[PDB]
Symmetry: C3
Subunit: 317 residues, 3 copies
């Protein structure tokens, strides 16, 4: 089935942020037996491997923005590969790696599917511009590089001249926000982006959050969905091995429900499993928990249901 025909892309990249180890995210997710569990779930899995991100020495900052050429090239490479995987009729599954890679993941997906709608699962908006950012970390900036409305607000940053904004403010829904910088809150509110902070999740429950999310994106007509999942969108009690954890996150149950509802639409075309840093758990158990949750999240994206699952055969015969 289309909703179970997958292409795996490893993105061992970390230079989009300061904490080392997120480049081991595809490695630890593969070792956890992701490809195997997907095949046991009636999925047609093709592995495209891990992208070779060659080192860029003398990659001086653009103002305060660190490693621009490295980030820009990594996303340039991932775009080409996501566009490749999408042309072959497969759902692209990107194993991160820091959230800056979403520039390439969405741009590559948009090349083949321009009418795509984004669902962004994160504690963060990641919408800072190279001028609004105070950190200079490009994993907190991918959405600003992708929005057509922020054209003219993004300066010519080294390594990003290949970029062409591919999504409008209207094409994205955020779920799980709880750590939004003031510039980002200004962008979020002035551009009129649809969002569900933890406040909206609390008020409505995840049930109506999904009803409202999917209706907003798929009301007009059926269109491709790109889910960019940052594991820090979930509470640190489920994904502690992450770069920027924030308390009061989405439960494991909510995370499963979101991915379960997206599967049921049959419109998943792109998936990002981002910010798994296996060198950041306090105990070895913390690392396995994060990886186990990220694996559980991905399987739900491709059919695994909590009510059970069966093949089209009579089990009583």
């Amino acid at each position: 089935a289309k909703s179970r025909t997958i292409g795996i892309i490893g993105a061992p990249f970390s230079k989009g942020q300061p904490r080392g180890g997120v480049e081991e995210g595809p490695t630890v997710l593969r070792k956890a037996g992701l490809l195997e569990k997907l095949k046991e779930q009636e999925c047609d899995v093709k592995d495209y491997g891990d992208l070779p991100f060659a080192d860029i020495p003398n990659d001086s900052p653009f103002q305060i923005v660190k490693n621009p050429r490295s980030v820009g090239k990594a996303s340039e490479q991932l775009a080409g590969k996501v566009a490749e995987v999408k042309k072959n009729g497969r759902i692209s599954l990107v194993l991160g790696g820091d959230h800056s890679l979403a520039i390439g993941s969405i741009s590559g997906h948009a090349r083949v599917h321009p009418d795509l709608g984004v669902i962004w699962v994160d504690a963060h908006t990641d919408i800072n511009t190279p001028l609004t950012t105070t950190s200079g970390n490009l994993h907190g900036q991918p959405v600003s590089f992708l929005l057509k409305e922020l054209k003219g607000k993004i300066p010519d940053v080294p390594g990003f001249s290949w970029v062409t904004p591919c999504i409008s403010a209207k094409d994205i829904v955020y779920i799980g926000l709880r750590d939004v910088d003031p510039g980002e809150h200004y962008i979020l509110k002035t551009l009129g982006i649809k969002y569900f902070s933890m406040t909206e999740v609390d008020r409505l429950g995840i049930g109506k959050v999904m009803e409202e999310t999917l209706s907003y994106l798929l009301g007009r007509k059926k269109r491709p969905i790109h889910l960019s999942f940052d594991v820090d969108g979930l509470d640190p009690s489920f994904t502690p091995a992450t770069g920027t954890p924030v308390v009061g996150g989405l439960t494991y149950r909510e995370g499963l429900y979101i991915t379960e509802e997206i599967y049921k639409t049959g419109l998943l075309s792109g998936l990002d499993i981002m910010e798994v840093n296996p060198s950041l758990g306090k105990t070895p158990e913390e690392v396995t928990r994060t990886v186990n949750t990220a694996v559980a999240i991905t399987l739900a994206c491709f059919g695994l249901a909590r009510e059970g699952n069966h093949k089209p055969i009579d089990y009583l015969n």
Copy 2:
């Protein structure tokens, strides 16, 4: 009062599953002060003691089905004891023991009240037949032996000739589901059994889940309610000392809300507190925590409300 009149049955049995210690559940629950706690709560409590489950050595498997004669005989003796407790005008409170004892508990209860409805609180459906089972552990099959619609699909298993299916597929509601086998999922779907998996709980909220459950079982006519509570129904952060734990469970609050709602009907007639295994904690606190949660669930079944309770007297005098 009828909703607070109780007959306690200790069912120290473990041969429905592979892990030793579930037979100590009735000891630990008593040791925790369950009898004293119910009497503080204005309950009329009679202790019927623990059932002697005399050794049945030479009980070789029926196909892949382990200990069939021991499991069947225990459920047959339990049925007889539940029927006697029911004849004494008391609510049978069976302290398990593995969940295979539900064959006996429900058969013996349906003997006195054939019009009963079942609420099954568990992470699992326990609806595998001796032919769909992969484990061959009978605690994962009790419901198949009880359903009228499965008559013809149950082989002639030694120790089970006394069993006549006593409930229709329409007289059962599952709450808590998150680990369902393929064969079980086929049965659940084709028989049209009402269930609220962790997906429905997430979607609706425990509030609507309880409203639908009580309307579905009592809307047509008021009838006795048999609640079969498997402690693995709750999240392993509340009930860790159990045989088959599954993440993303029902919360402590959700557990108490289910039971407070059942108490308020005044129609609870049978209760099963199953799968407590005091040998299965990672620490001695994990054990006390499971017993404490189980005790708390039991108290809510017999009137203990979080808003408070008071006797019919003038407290300001």
Copy 3:
């Protein structure tokens, strides 16, 4: 802005209960940088200091009621300081200290704002009278001294001759109740007090609770709100360093949702942060977890929003 204009009152008092350390509550909340954090989110902050509570030797009990003169004088002192702050056109922020100080806090507030409405966030009703109490601890009795409808039910207790009942049973809403004594539950029913115990929060969701809480108090017209927040209203997994902890409490999210909703009305006029006891942590991390949670709740009462916050300028310039 009125909603962000604060008068800080430290109340290091513990004699309303038998556990040492609750007097260090103002100290640890200040140490964690509360004032600095409020100033950072555009609040006008005046520090009225930590009140000096003179020792009362020969403070003989009233029947079973412990330290009546000490608790009575501490509240009488706090009433004077709260009324002074209210007369300055500032919202009073009381850093406790046990909950018996709510006698002084609400009394002092009602002196300047007789039309006030109270939101009581607790695991407890704290409505026992000096005659219904079984512990004799005054922190479990403040509401009884404040309620107009309990005039004639409260005897002449030394230290409380200055008290005038200032709120009607119709002017208070409880949130989070799960440990209510018989006498308290009886007072709740005979006086027709509006409450949302954990049972109602479970049935309705924190969204409906807040819609209903605000419309019950403000339906007729706008009126000042006094939020009395006991940290034990929240689950011991978020606030463990407290004297009387009860399992199955409000989540970290629910706590913020309540306080974010109260900020939005712009009617917050009085606030108490009660029962933080830093000497009741099992580990130093338990203490920092209670304090950080208590700070998070306080900041949400004065504008900090999970969706984000921005100054009234152009960030894209």
